Design an enzyme around this catalytic site. Structure first.
Site, PDB file in Angstrom:
ATOM      1  N   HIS A  44       6.308   7.061   5.945  1.00 33.20           N
ATOM      2  CA  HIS A  44       5.854   6.580   4.563  1.00 33.20           C
ATOM      3  C   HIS A  44       5.135   7.611   4.149  1.00 33.20           C
ATOM      4  O   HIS A  44       5.100   8.698   4.692  1.00 33.20           O
ATOM      5  CB  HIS A  44       4.970   5.315   4.872  1.00 33.20           C
ATOM      6  CG  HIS A  44       3.701   5.787   5.670  1.00 33.20           C
ATOM      7  ND1 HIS A  44       3.546   5.503   6.787  1.00 33.20           N
ATOM      8  CD2 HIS A  44       2.621   6.137   5.263  1.00 33.20           C
ATOM      9  CE1 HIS A  44       2.602   5.942   7.495  1.00 33.20           C
ATOM     10  NE2 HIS A  44       1.705   6.406   6.254  1.00 33.20           N
ATOM     11  N   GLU A  81      -3.317  13.273   1.989  1.00 34.25           N
ATOM     12  CA  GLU A  81      -4.313  12.911   2.671  1.00 34.25           C
ATOM     13  C   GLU A  81      -5.262  14.093   3.446  1.00 34.25           C
ATOM     14  O   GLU A  81      -6.435  14.394   3.098  1.00 34.25           O
ATOM     15  CB  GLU A  81      -4.089  11.930   3.539  1.00 34.25           C
ATOM     16  CG  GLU A  81      -3.507  10.728   2.865  1.00 34.25           C
ATOM     17  CD  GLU A  81      -3.735   9.429   3.634  1.00 34.25           C
ATOM     18  OE1 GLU A  81      -3.371   9.413   4.678  1.00 34.25           O
ATOM     19  OE2 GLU A  81      -4.316   8.681   3.152  1.00 34.25           O
ATOM     20  N   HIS A  94       4.225  10.921   6.230  1.00 32.72           N
ATOM     21  CA  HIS A  94       3.740  10.596   7.597  1.00 32.72           C
ATOM     22  C   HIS A  94       5.221   9.779   8.623  1.00 32.72           C
ATOM     23  O   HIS A  94       5.490   8.741   7.988  1.00 32.72           O
ATOM     24  CB  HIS A  94       2.761   9.538   7.771  1.00 32.72           C
ATOM     25  CG  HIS A  94       1.386  10.022   7.063  1.00 32.72           C
ATOM     26  ND1 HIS A  94       0.419   9.553   6.610  1.00 32.72           N
ATOM     27  CD2 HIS A  94       1.175  11.497   6.920  1.00 32.72           C
ATOM     28  CE1 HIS A  94      -0.532  10.249   6.305  1.00 32.72           C
ATOM     29  NE2 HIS A  94      -0.225  11.681   6.265  1.00 32.72           N
ATOM     30  N   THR A 137      -4.917   6.457   8.637  1.00 31.74           N
ATOM     31  CA  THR A 137      -5.600   6.595   7.493  1.00 31.74           C
ATOM     32  C   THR A 137      -5.808   5.367   6.830  1.00 31.74           C
ATOM     33  O   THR A 137      -6.274   5.367   5.688  1.00 31.74           O
ATOM     34  CB  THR A 137      -5.126   7.675   6.749  1.00 31.74           C
ATOM     35  OG1 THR A 137      -3.752   7.426   6.354  1.00 31.74           O
ATOM     36  CG2 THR A 137      -4.910   8.916   7.736  1.00 31.74           C
ATOM     37  N   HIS A 158       0.816  -1.266   0.004  1.00 31.91           N
ATOM     38  CA  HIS A 158       0.041   0.114  -0.009  1.00 31.91           C
ATOM     39  C   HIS A 158       0.836   1.306   0.016  1.00 31.91           C
ATOM     40  O   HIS A 158       0.372   2.436  -0.157  1.00 31.91           O
ATOM     41  CB  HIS A 158      -1.108  -0.072   0.854  1.00 31.91           C
ATOM     42  CG  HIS A 158      -0.752  -0.283   2.455  1.00 31.91           C
ATOM     43  ND1 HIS A 158      -0.444   0.401   3.404  1.00 31.91           N
ATOM     44  CD2 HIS A 158      -0.500  -1.459   3.045  1.00 31.91           C
ATOM     45  CE1 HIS A 158      -0.101  -0.217   4.507  1.00 31.91           C
ATOM     46  NE2 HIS A 158      -0.330  -1.377   4.278  1.00 31.91           N
ATOM     47  N   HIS A 189       1.990   9.132   1.060  1.00 32.69           N
ATOM     48  CA  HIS A 189       0.939   8.827   0.378  1.00 32.69           C
ATOM     49  C   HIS A 189       1.127   9.866  -0.845  1.00 32.69           C
ATOM     50  O   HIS A 189       1.528  11.055  -0.780  1.00 32.69           O
ATOM     51  CB  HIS A 189      -0.260   9.397   0.998  1.00 32.69           C
ATOM     52  CG  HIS A 189      -0.403   8.728   2.253  1.00 32.69           C
ATOM     53  ND1 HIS A 189      -1.276   7.470   2.347  1.00 32.69           N
ATOM     54  CD2 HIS A 189      -0.017   8.846   3.705  1.00 32.69           C
ATOM     55  CE1 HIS A 189      -1.215   6.834   3.468  1.00 32.69           C
ATOM     56  NE2 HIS A 189      -0.308   7.542   4.273  1.00 32.69           N
TER      57      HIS A 189
HETATM   58 ZN    ZN Z   1       0.066   7.477   6.126  1.00 33.49          ZN
END
Ligand code: ZN
Length: 258
Positions: free
Chosen positions: A92, A104, A117, A196, A62, A94
């Site tokens: 990590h 996000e 994050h 999240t 992911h 997004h």
């Molecule tokens: Zn995250």
């Protein structure tokens, strides 16, 4: 039929396996800068990353996580809205399929190209697995990425991504200093929220930095070459691995700055 970010397993489906997805303190949220409350009692953040020990980088299907040794108080976050000491376990990102989306959190509905994050857990709970079961268990430092000049401190991450292209691949990743990912200012917004991604547990104190870092188009393009799938499975590019903003419900976003 695992959860993911596709049309048939994406965020609008997660509530069927994870009913907390419709909970009272879900993340991310839109940060309305005009209704955020300046709180003069908020302390400055204390980021002590000089003894951080990175270990590995992993494609988990992911995102990719850079993992740290969290068996001692080596890289810790304190201060701000936090009580106690929170140890860095992983970071990590997004990101989007296009430069106009990927974050996000949003700021006055504005989306950034990506969001970093840095995940920390409260040492009073002894390990990460216990911390996620507590309302004050995690603190996540969120940093926005905009496309512009390159960030030299990110290049070591970008250059190893070819080695972890597919789900389940990992590579040694030692001596990475996360201080190279921080903006100049540590002014922040904070609110109580959740992870999240599933299990979406409502255990996070979010600390979202106001100042974005700039990364180059070439750097973010390399994120978009990763794969959600494992080796030998059909290729699905790892893009748009972000959850949309959730309702604020009975929560107040506080700002450390006027
Ligand atoms: Zn995250």
């Amino acid at each position: 039929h695992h959860w993911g970010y596709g049309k048939h397993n994406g965020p609008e489906h997660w509530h069927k396996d994870f009913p907390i997805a419709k909970g009272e303190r879900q993340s991310p949220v839109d940060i309305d800068t005009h209704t955020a409350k300046y709180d003069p009692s908020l302390k400055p953040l204390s980021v002590s990353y000089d003894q951080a020990t990175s270990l590995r980088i992993l494609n988990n299907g992911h995102a990719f996580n850079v993992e740290f040794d969290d068996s001692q108080d080596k890289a810790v976050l304190k201060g701000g809205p936090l009580d106690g000491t929170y140890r860095l376990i992983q970071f990590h990102f997004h990101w989007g399929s296009l430069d106009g989306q990927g974050s996000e959190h949003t700021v006055d509905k504005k989306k950034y190209a990506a969001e970093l994050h840095l995940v920390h857990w409260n040492t009073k709970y002894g390990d990460f697995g216990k911390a996620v079961q507590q309302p004050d268990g995690l603190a996540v430092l969120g940093i926005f990425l905009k496309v512009g000049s390159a960030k030299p401190g990110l290049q070591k991450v970008v250059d190893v991504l070819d080695s972890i292209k597919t789900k389940g691949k990992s590579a040694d990743f030692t001596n990475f200093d996360p201080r190279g990912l921080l903006p100049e200012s540590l002014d922040y917004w904070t609110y109580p929220g959740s992870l999240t991604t599933p299990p979406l547990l409502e255990c996070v104190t979010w600390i979202v930095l106001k100042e974005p870092i700039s990364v180059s188009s070439e750097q973010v393009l390399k994120f978009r070459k990763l794969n959600f799938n494992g080796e030998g499975e059909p290729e699905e590019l790892m893009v748009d691995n972000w959850r949309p903003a959730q309702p604020l419900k009975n929560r107040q976003i506080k700002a450390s700055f006027k």
